[PDB]
Design a protein around this ligand. Structure first.
Ligand SMILES: CCCCCCCCCCCCCCCCO
Length: 223
């Protein structure tokens, strides 16, 4: 009983949908830079970027389906600080920090958003998103397997990158709140599903329960 036609919904949608398009666009780029920095896995590293471009096109289609023009300007600025950190990190061969930003933080944020979105999405959008989500399950998380295979060498930079970057996702959660509520996506649910995905991700890489509690609390304990 959400009105996908009303002006509130389309308005909030212009920004939310833009965020996802932009996030996919930057994932595409990011996974290309990662293809350079790790030329060795560039094959698998190139397949993911392409996959996100597909996903990006899908969400664009979700936009026209609702006859909504996505505010791509607002979306660019939503990702800017994290995009800056990724760029700077990338410049300096800091591949661990790049993977944490893209493979862990960005992709946990998206998986959380997609699952909250589905049960309240319109028919077309729900289909695309179910597809996107399936694609994410049925492919290895590259950066996560890498970081895991390389944990001891990467542990310290990860903790640092987590301190530099986790708070920015926290800002993004607060910024996206109003509009997401309009779409029927509860803010509490998003924070919850994010932490669950991120915490599990940090476990898989090699962090202990105590380390995971410490690292997860870095955004919210400042708030
Ligand atoms: C039309 C999609 C609805 C879900 C919107 C989620 C609200 C904000 C989260 C955006 C996260 C974008 C990350 C994409 C990265 C891709 O790998």
């Amino acid at each position: 009983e959400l009105d996908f036609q009303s002006e509130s919904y389309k308005d909030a949608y212009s920004r939310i949908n833009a965020i996802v398009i932009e996030g996919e666009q930057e994932a595409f780029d990011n996974y290309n830079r990662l293809a350079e920095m790790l030329p060795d896995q560039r094959d698998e590293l190139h397949k993911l970027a392409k996959m996100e471009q597909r996903h990006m096109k899908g969400f664009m289609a979700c936009g026209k389906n609702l006859s909504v023009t996505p505010d791509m300007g607002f979306a660019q600025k939503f990702f800017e600080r994290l995009h800056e950190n990724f760029k700077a990190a990338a410049a300096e061969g800091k591949v661990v920090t790049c993977l944490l930003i893209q493979s862990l933080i960005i992709e946990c944020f998206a998986i959380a958003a997609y699952n909250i979105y589905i049960p309240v999405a319109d028919a077309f959008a729900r289909k695309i998103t179910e597809g996107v989500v399936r694609d994410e399950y049925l492919h290895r998380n590259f950066g996560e397997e890498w970081l895991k295979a390389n944990f001891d060498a990467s542990k310290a930079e990860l903790e640092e990158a987590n301190r530099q970057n986790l708070p920015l996702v926290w800002l993004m959660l607060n910024e996206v709140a109003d509009d997401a509520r309009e779409l029927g996506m509860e803010r509490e649910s998003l924070v919850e599903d994010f932490m669950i995905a991120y915490g599990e991700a940090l476990e898989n890489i090699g962090f202990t329960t105590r380390e995971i509690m410490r690292m997860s609390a870095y955004g919210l304990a400042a708030v």
